[PDB]
Write an enzyme that holds these catalytic residues in place. Structure first.
Site, PDB file in Angstrom:
ATOM      1  CD  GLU A 200      -2.955  -0.990   2.343  1.00  0.00           C
ATOM      2  OE1 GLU A 200      -2.554  -0.715   3.498  1.00  0.00           O
ATOM      3  OE2 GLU A 200      -4.154  -1.217   2.064  1.00  0.00           O
ATOM      4  CD  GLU A 201       6.246   2.779   2.927  1.00  0.00           C
ATOM      5  OE1 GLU A 201       6.195   1.770   3.672  1.00  0.00           O
ATOM      6  OE2 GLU A 201       7.254   3.517   2.843  1.00  0.00           O
ATOM      7  N   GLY A 202       3.892   1.587  -1.397  1.00  0.00           N
ATOM      8  CA  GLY A 202       4.337   1.728  -2.783  1.00  0.00           C
ATOM      9  C   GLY A 202       3.313   2.411  -3.675  1.00  0.00           C
TER      10      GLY A 202
END
Ligand code: AMP
Lengths: 593, 51
Positions: A200-202
């Site tokens: 999700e960070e990516g």
């Protein structure tokens, strides 16, 4: 008779008033993103222009979003739980089995620990607002309410009981209860304040990159007619390589006309509710590699290199990624380069760089009993899940690590241990992830011509260090051989002890720089970069260009916000007009009384 | 003759390991949204077919 002039003044006065009641009104809003990383918790203060239109409600102009302050790096969220578990479960909790049920007695004690940290973040946030906003802006910001987005990346995700999610319930209760003396209306909800995964960070970093560089927008860059006769539109988006502390993310647009194997999937940002339907459809290859983080790669590298007979002889591990003259205790523990010239290795279990991977590789907890290959992958890296934690992280028959400063051997080992291991770690199949298992598989099966941006402080340090010593040209555009030849020179440097402390002394009297805790093992990052570029070059499709960026310049030339996941998180809430209007303005801070 | 299939409703409130996933019939466009949500465990093994 200038009676006509004073008639028109009256007519125009009424028109000015009519326009004022029919047109949109602009008001400034502050937004707060709390970056709760593995080893630190930091506040990020943003400003945005809201537009209030008759019969349409209030919305944010997404292009107006700008960072006005990054706060003090406080203690990581992990520390709150570690200290709570040290006081109430006993300091022995990291090794001995603990009955989690009994810990429900200490819920207001956990609440107090989290209160201390939240007060410090609140204090620091209020400080940034007061120092950056004029009195007029303060009136607008105080009246509108201040949405707060606290997102934990790594560290917290490693507990595996009720503690983690309970901590979140407590943080939100604290965020929604700010002191009234300052007048800033801080508020949150479980949709804004929650943990996020590496994957999700990516996706958030991909959105941030593309918004700041102005590639992402409602207007498509190019349209095309498909086999059925329907117009298919897209933006010309750039991909991102983000190397963090706990993981590395690779997110780039899916190559047009590419059909992925059945076992992997393009992540559609509209389907995942990251972008609204009014934005051109975005299908991406999304990958998060847990072993490719700065900290996790350092731990795994030592564990695997120092268990190899070519490198380990009579208790001495010869490390090709470390400088000639450097020496440290043989363990994956956190390294402190002392002014003395020596290396101090923190032997604390909590400070071991292998801890996330060793907790993931256990009999007591996950996927290890599920798939046979999972337990097979742990044993390969000399971490047998049946053994206690200390033993699992221990580098056996090894006393010291000596640097040999051999870049080619370093590249060969980074390739063999981290980039193309014989047995990859299990593929992640969450919604945010494409389901790839290795870097080679990504570039062999799903390569793209989309430009690539390389990000992360360590990655940029690797390039800038070489540029600083005039080994790499300032116009360096990502050529492999150029990088390898530059790093081969720098990486063959000797550790020299001077009165002002230890120095990395370059060959052929090229110069020197101070040796420190942050740069001692940077040759592993130069080797990781060489390896990534080689795998990208071997792809059927080549990125149109490759650039290393820390910041994206704005319309005035000044960066509006910083690269990372923060902007992407704001956007995925703010772009959904109706849902944002309902949550941030209708419910708002008044939802807390 | 060629493969064996096992498909059954996912037990209510069950945590599937992050390496496997439930198949939602509505998300796969196999059942309309007006039917109750159907989450299933779905396996097909060629090696378990009679031949
Ligand atoms: N100048 C640097 N040299 C080496 N590592 C760094 C540097 N700056 C940041 N890092 C590391 O790179 C990772 C990502 O850093 P950042 O992009 O600043 O979040 C973390 O593990 C940092 O500790």
């Amino acid at each position: 008779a200038d009676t006509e002039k004073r008639i028109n003044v009256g007519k125009k006065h009424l028109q000015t008033l009519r326009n004022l009641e029919t047109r949109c009104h602009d008001s400034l809003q502050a937004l707060v993103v709390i970056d709760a990383g593995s080893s630190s918790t930091r506040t990020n203060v943003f400003l945005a222009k809201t537009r209030s239109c008759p019969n349409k409600g209030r919305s944010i102009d997404p292009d107006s979003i700008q960072l006005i302050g990054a706060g003090k790096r406080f203690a990581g969220l992990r520390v709150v739980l570690e200290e709570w578990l040290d006081t109430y479960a006993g300091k022995d909790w990291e090794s001995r089995p603990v009955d989690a049920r009994l810990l429900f007695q200490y819920v207001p004690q956990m609440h107090e620990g989290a209160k201390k940290l939240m007060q410090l973040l609140e204090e620091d946030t209020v400080a940034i607002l007061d120092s950056q906003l004029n009195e007029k802006q303060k009136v607008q910001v105080k009246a509108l309410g201040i949405p707060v987005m606290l997102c934990s990346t790594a560290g917290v995700r490693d507990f595996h009981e009720w503690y983690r999610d309970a901590l979140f319930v407590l943080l939100r209760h604290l965020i929604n209860n700010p002191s009234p003396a300052h007048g800033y209306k801080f508020f949150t909800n479980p949709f804004w304040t929650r943990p996020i995964t590496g994957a999700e960070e990516g996706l958030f970093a991909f959105i941030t990159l593309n918004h700041l560089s102005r590639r992402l927008g409602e207007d498509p860059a190019r349209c095309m007619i498909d086999e059925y006769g329907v117009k298919q539109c897209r933006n010309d988006l750039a991909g991102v390589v983000e190397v963090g502390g706990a993981s590395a993310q690779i997110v780039f647009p899916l190559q047009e006309g590419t059909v992925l194997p059945s076992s992997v999937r393009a992540v559609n940002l509209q389907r995942e509710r990251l972008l609204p339907e009014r934005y051109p459809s975005a299908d991406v290859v999304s990958v998060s590699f847990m072993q490719l983080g700065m900290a996790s790669s350092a731990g795994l590298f030592l564990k695997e290199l120092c268990s190899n007979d070519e490198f380990l002889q009579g208790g001495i591990c010869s490390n090709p990624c470390l400088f000639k003259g450097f020496q440290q205790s043989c363990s994956a523990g956190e390294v402190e380069v002392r002014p003395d010239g020596s290396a101090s290795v923190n032997e604390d279990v909590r400070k071991n760089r292998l801890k996330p991977l060793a907790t993931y590789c256990s009999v007591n907890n996950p996927e290890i009993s599920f798939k046979v290959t999972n337990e097979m992958q742990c044993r390969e890296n000399s971490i047998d899940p049946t053994k206690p934690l200390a033993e699992r992280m221990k580098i056996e028959n090894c006393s010291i690590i000596k640097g040999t400063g051999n870049f080619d051997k370093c590249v060969s080992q980074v390739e063999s241990i981290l980039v193309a291991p014989k047995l990859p770690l299990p593929a992640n199949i969450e919604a945010a992830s494409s389901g790839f298992e290795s870097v080679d598989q990504v570039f062999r099966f799903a390569s793209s011509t989309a430009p690539m941006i390389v990000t992360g402080g360590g990655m940029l340090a690797a390039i800038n260090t070489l540029k600083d010593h005039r080994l790499l040209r300032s116009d360096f555009s990502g050529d492999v051989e150029e990088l390898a030849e530059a790093a081969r020179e720098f990486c063959s440097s000797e550790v020299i002890i001077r009165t002002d402390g230890p120095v990395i002394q370059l060959p052929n009297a090229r110069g020197e720089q101070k040796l420190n805790s942050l740069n001692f093992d940077l040759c592993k990052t130069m080797a990781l970069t060489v390896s990534l570029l080689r795998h990208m070059a071997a792809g059927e499709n080549q990125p149109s260009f490759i650039k290393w960026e820390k910041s994206i310049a704005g319309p005035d030339g000044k960066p509006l916000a910083d690269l990372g996941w923060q902007v992407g998180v704001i956007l995925h809430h703010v772009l959904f007009t109706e849902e944002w209007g309902r949550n941030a303005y209708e419910a708002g801070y008044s939802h807390n009384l």
